[PDB]
């Protein structure tokens, strides 16, 4: 397909994120690379405005890349077929003890480089919770269930954010992935799972600089 010519064995990506959590404005930029067909990617993130953030970088880490999924033979790749136009995603994340995050993301391809704009709106995190107290130590591995939905995908995840001393902050994502393609055809997948391993490396003392690595692999349900 026309999508999986434009998506080379090695792709670069850059991201602008802007938003607020409990009324705190911030901007982050990031740039990285990976292998879309191995499901592997890494990106270097800076907080350029509102830093240091008075909340866990962990609530932003899942908003920084669905072109980099290893789709086994037998499961159509919605994301790679979307190009050259790309796709959007919108997500509601409801955290166990109050917090609600709204995300609208645009994915474009410009000059063979993937471009992400991310709009983030976090509210109602408890002032003394581990998110607003910066007492989180990253995510457990994720399985996202992908469901076909009127020519897009619906993504459903139950996730675990790790907190200081052990125990977890449970949260659920529902994500709507829509293609921006207006000229052309698509092969839709059926229901399938995507396993995601999202890790932090190389964080600065106050998470002003963060490297994320992700490994995303599709499988049968």
Author numbering: 4 to 67, 71 to 227
Paper quotes:
There is one protein molecule per asymmetric unit, and contact analysis revealed that the protein is a monomer in the crystal. The chromophore positioned on the central helix of the barrel is formed by 68LYG70 amino acids. The chromophore is covalently bound to the neighboring F67 and S71 residues. The chromophore has a clear electron density except for its phenolic moiety, where density is poor. Moreover, compared to the parental protein mRuby (corresponding residue H148), in mRubyFTS148I, isoleucine is shifted 1.3 Å closer (distance between Cα-atoms of corresponding residues) to the chromophore. This shift in the orientation of the I148 side chain hampers the rotation of the phenolic moiety of the chromophore to a cis conformation and restricts it from being coplanar with the imidazolidinone moiety.
The mRubyFT is a monomeric genetically encoded fluorescent timer based on the mRuby2 fluorescent protein, which is characterized by the complete maturation of the blue form with the subsequent conversion to the red one. Blue-to-red fluorescent timers (FTs) change their fluorescence color from blue to red during maturation.
